[PDB]
Amino acid sequence: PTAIEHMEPPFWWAGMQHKGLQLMVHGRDIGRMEAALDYPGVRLVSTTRVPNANYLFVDLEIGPEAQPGSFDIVFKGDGRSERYRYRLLAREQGSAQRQGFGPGDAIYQIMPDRFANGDPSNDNVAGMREQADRRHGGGRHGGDIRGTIDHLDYIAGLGFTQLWPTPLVENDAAAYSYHGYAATDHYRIDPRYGSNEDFVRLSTEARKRGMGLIQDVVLSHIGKHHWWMKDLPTPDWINYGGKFVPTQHHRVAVQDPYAAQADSENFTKGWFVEGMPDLNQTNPLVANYLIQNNIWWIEYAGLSGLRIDTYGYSDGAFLTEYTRRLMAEYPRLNMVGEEWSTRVPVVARWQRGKANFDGYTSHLPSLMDFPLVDAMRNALSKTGEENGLNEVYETLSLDYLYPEPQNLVLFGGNHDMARMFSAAGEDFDRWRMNLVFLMTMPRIPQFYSGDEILMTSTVKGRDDASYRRDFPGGWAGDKANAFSGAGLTSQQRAAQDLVRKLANWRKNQPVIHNGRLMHFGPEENTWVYFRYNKDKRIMVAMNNNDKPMTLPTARFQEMLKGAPSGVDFLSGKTVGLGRELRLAPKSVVVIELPGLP
Ligand SMILES: [Ca+2]
Ligand SMILES: [Ca+2]
Which amino acid makes up residue 516?
Answer: R
Cβ atoms of 467 and 416 closer than 8 Å:
yes
The rounded distance, in Å, linking the Cα atoms of 163 and 110 is 8
Cβ atoms of 541 and 573 closer than 8 Å:
no
For residues 574 and 533, state if they share a domain. yes
Note the Cα 418 to chain centre separation in Å.
17
Whether the upstream peptide bond of residue 371 has omega within 30° of 0, thus cis, is: no
The ligand whose atoms approach the alpha carbon of 191 most closely is 1
| CATH number of the domain bearing residue 464 | 3.20.20.80
Q: Taking ligand 1, which is a single-atom ion, which protein residues have CB atoms under 5 Å away?
A: 117, 119, 122-123, 142, 144
Cβ atoms of 29 and 53 closer than 8 Å:
yes
369 annotated among ligand-binding-site residues: no
The DSSP output letter for 229 is G
CB atoms within 10 A of CB 429: 18
For residues 214 and 352, state if they share a domain. yes
CB atoms within 10 A of CB 178: 28
Cβ atoms of 96 and 144 closer than 8 Å:
no
| CATH number of the domain bearing residue 55 | 2.60.40.10
Final residue before a domain boundary, out of 515, 540, 560 = 515
CA of 11 to the centre of ligand 1 (A): 28
123 annotated among ligand-binding-site residues: yes
- List 205, 338, 339, 451, catalytic entry: 338
The rounded distance, in Å, linking the Cα atoms of 184 and 397 is 42
Find, among 364, 410, 430, the residue nearest to 107 by Cα: 410
Final residue before a domain boundary, out of 459, 494, 515 = 515
- List 309, 315, 399, 451, catalytic entry: 309
Catalytic site residue 338?
Answer: yes
CA of 35 to the centre of ligand 1 (A): 42
CA of 461 to the centre of ligand 2 (A): 25
| DSSP per residue, 37-89 | E-BTTEEEEEEE--SSTTEEEEEEEE-TT--SEEEEEEEEETTEEEEEEEEEE
The rounded distance, in Å, linking the Cα atoms of 98 and 94 is 6
For residues 113 and 81, state if they share a domain. no
For residues 79 and 207, state if they share a domain. no
For residues 248 and 103, state if they share a domain. yes
Number of domains in the chain: 3
Distances (CA, A) of 339 to 309, 321, 335, 436, 461: 8, 18, 13, 24, 21
Give 198's contacts (C-beta < 8 A, 6+ positions apart): 145, 146, 149, 189
For residues 334 and 235, state if they share a domain. yes
Which amino acid makes up residue 284?
Answer: P
Q: Is 69 exposed, middle or buried (0-12, 13-18, 19+ CB in 10 A)?
A: middle
Which residues are registered as beta bridge partners of 87? 70
144 annotated among ligand-binding-site residues: yes
Give 430's contacts (C-beta < 8 A, 6+ positions apart): 380, 424, 544, 586
543 annotated among ligand-binding-site residues: no
Cβ atoms of 140 and 177 closer than 8 Å:
yes
119 annotated among ligand-binding-site residues: yes
The ligand whose atoms approach the alpha carbon of 246 most closely is 2
The rounded distance, in Å, linking the Cα atoms of 65 and 241 is 43
For residues 85 and 48, state if they share a domain. yes
The rounded distance, in Å, linking the Cα atoms of 303 and 329 is 13
Query: β-pairing, 526-532 with 516-519?
Result: antiparallel
| CATH number of the domain bearing residue 572 | 2.60.40.1180
The rounded distance, in Å, linking the Cα atoms of 74 and 142 is 42
Give 404's contacts (C-beta < 8 A, 6+ positions apart): 351, 352, 353, 365, 366
Phi/psi at 12 (5° precision) = -140, -170
CA of 185 to the centre of ligand 2 (A): 18
- Can you give the C-alpha Rg of the chain in angstroms? 25
Find, among 564, 368, 522, 510, the residue nearest to 433 by Cα: 522
209-241 in b/e burial notation, b at 16+ Cβ within 10 A?
Answer: eebbbbbbbbbbbbbbbbbbeeebbeeebbbbe
For residues 488 and 404, state if they share a domain. yes
Distances (CA, A) of 526 to 32, 390, 392, 541, 583: 71, 9, 12, 7, 9
**Helix, strand, coil % over all residues of the chain, rounded to 5:** 30, 25, 45
Find, among 88, 79, 81, 83, the residue nearest to 15 by Cα: 88
- Strand intervals (E) in 488-535: 516-519, 526-532
CA of 125 to the centre of ligand 1 (A): 10
The rounded distance, in Å, linking the Cα atoms of 163 and 208 is 13
The SS3 of residue 368 is strand
Phi/psi at 283 (5° precision) = -80, 120
Final residue before a domain boundary, out of 515, 550, 585 = 515
Any idea what the Cα angle at residue 450 is, between residues 183 and 214, rounded to 5°? Answer: 45
The DSSP output letter for 251 is G
Resolution in A: 2.1
Which amino acid makes up residue 299?
Answer: E
For residues 119 and 84, state if they share a domain. no
117 annotated among ligand-binding-site residues: yes
For residues 60 and 83, state if they share a domain. yes
CB atoms within 10 A of CB 597: 4
The ligand whose atoms approach the alpha carbon of 115 most closely is 1
For residues 143 and 179, state if they share a domain. yes
Distances (CA, A) of 263 to 22, 112, 319, 595: 32, 35, 18, 52
Catalytic site residue 385?
Answer: no
172 annotated among ligand-binding-site residues: no
Which amino acid makes up residue 270?
Answer: G
Cβ atoms of 184 and 190 closer than 8 Å:
no
Find, among 509, 480, 478, 483, the residue nearest to 496 by Cα: 483
Cβ atoms of 90 and 44 closer than 8 Å:
no
Cβ atoms of 112 and 103 closer than 8 Å:
no
Determine the structural domain holding residue 464 and report its residue range. 97-515
The ligand whose atoms approach the alpha carbon of 125 most closely is 1
CA of 300 to the centre of ligand 2 (A): 26
Note the Cα 68 to chain centre separation in Å.
32
The rounded distance, in Å, linking the Cα atoms of 141 and 43 is 47
For residues 36 and 167, state if they share a domain. no
Cβ atoms of 349 and 311 closer than 8 Å:
no
Cβ atoms of 216 and 109 closer than 8 Å:
no
Residue 212 is inside which H or E element, if any?
strand 212-217
CA of 453 to the centre of ligand 1 (A): 23
